[PDB]
Amino acid sequence: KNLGGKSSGRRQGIKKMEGHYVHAGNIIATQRHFRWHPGAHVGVGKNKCLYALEEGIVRYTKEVYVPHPRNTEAVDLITRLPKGAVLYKTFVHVVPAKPEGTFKLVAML
């Protein structure tokens, strides 16, 4: 009488751990619900996936969650906490390694 339920695992989770070198566009962490939020130099997909935006090193921090004011499912939560409470989520950053470019002499005009 129990049908269905045969779905395979979605293989979501951390692809690049902390300290791992990352190139631009490398998918950091595939997820279904927002478990790790995107930090510095990390973008989001439509399917909530985190991908690096610069070449650098993946770091996981705990940061203060301030949501967007136009997000009412998480602002009406924010206006319900007691007066000292502050939310925290874990964020994924990429501390970019290489600089953006160096000034090189091309000619002696």
Partner: protein, 116 residues
């Protein structure tokens, strides 16, 4: 992560509560859910004092439930303004019910009616 010292840094639902008999249990004695009726024949003077007692419960930290009205009687309309109140101490049930009494503007009638 569970093995870590920062485990549960991000738990938040234990700071929200996401869901009456009088509380006189042994010594902690509080009133039940009161009703402060207010009545006059004016749309202003029935709402103006009932705006006051709400802001007085806000300043003096009393859990207000409701501020609704009763449907009028044809007798010229009767206006009723009912403020629900829970939470009174031993000490506070005097200082509330006097300054409430002593600040009624003009012929407006009071109540310490209750639930059901």
């Amino acid at each position: 992560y569970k093995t870590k010292p920062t485990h549960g840094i991000g738990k938040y639902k234990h700071l929200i509560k996401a869901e009456v008999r009088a509380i006189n249990l042994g010594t902690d004695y509080e009133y039940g859910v009161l009703n402060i009726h207010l009545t006059a024949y004016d749309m202003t003077l029935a709402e103006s004092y009932a705006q006051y007692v709400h802001n007085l419960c806000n300043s003096l930290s009393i859990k207000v439930e409701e501020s609704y009205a009763m449907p009028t009687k044809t007798i010229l309309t009767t206006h009723e303004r009912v403020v629900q109140i829970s939470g009174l101490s031993a000490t506070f049930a005097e200082i509330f019910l006097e300054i409430i009494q002593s600040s009624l503007p003009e012929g407006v009638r009071l109540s310490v009616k209750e639930h059901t």
